[PDB]
């Protein structure tokens, strides 16, 4: 149940995030950060180089935009 | 990675800057522009596009230090 929100397969989205080139992965981090709401669980540990996100905390519209971006850039 | 700087970490860190602190990145890059740097400021579109691999190692270190200080 935790793997689909708003008809977006979050596991498929997460698999696709891994295939992005490093400069296109930064674009995902930008899209998440630029659209951040308080309900979104997003942690950017800058010195560690890790960006931690609860995909289920994201609004359906943003998930759809992230999934479209991931399909476009893989 | 170029110099002592992980370019991907630098890029991730740039995303965490507040909008007013991003202006300081644009300032620092523009103030230190060399021909070999690939830097575009599309002013009317509000876009600042840089090849991090094209930046000299000293500027990358000062950028990384700025990012650590302001995030």
């Amino acid at each position: 149940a935790s793997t689909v929100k708003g008809s977006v397969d979050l596991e498929k989205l997460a698999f696709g995030l891994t295939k992005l080139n490093e400069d296109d992965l930064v674009g995902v981090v930008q899209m998440v950060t630029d659209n951040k709401t308080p309900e979104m669980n997003v942690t950017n540990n800058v010195e560690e180089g890790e960006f931690i996100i609860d995909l289920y905390s994201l609004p359906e519209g943003l998930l759809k935009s992230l999934w479209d971006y991931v399909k476009k850039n893989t | 990675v170029k110099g002592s700087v992980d370019l991907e970490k630098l890029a991730f860190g740039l995303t965490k800057l507040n909008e007013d602190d991003l202006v300081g990145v644009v300032q620092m890059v523009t103030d230190n522009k060399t021909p070999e740097m690939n830097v575009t400021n599309n002013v009317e579109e509000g876009e600042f596009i840089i090849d991090l691999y094209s930046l000299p190692e000293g500027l990358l270190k000062s950028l990384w230090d700025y990012v650590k200080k302001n995030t």
Binding site: G27 | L14, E19, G46, E47, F48, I49, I50, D51, L52
Partner: peptide, 9 residues
Amino acid sequence: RSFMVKIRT
């Protein structure tokens, strides 16, 4: 040879 970053308003 490139790592493009686009800072956008």
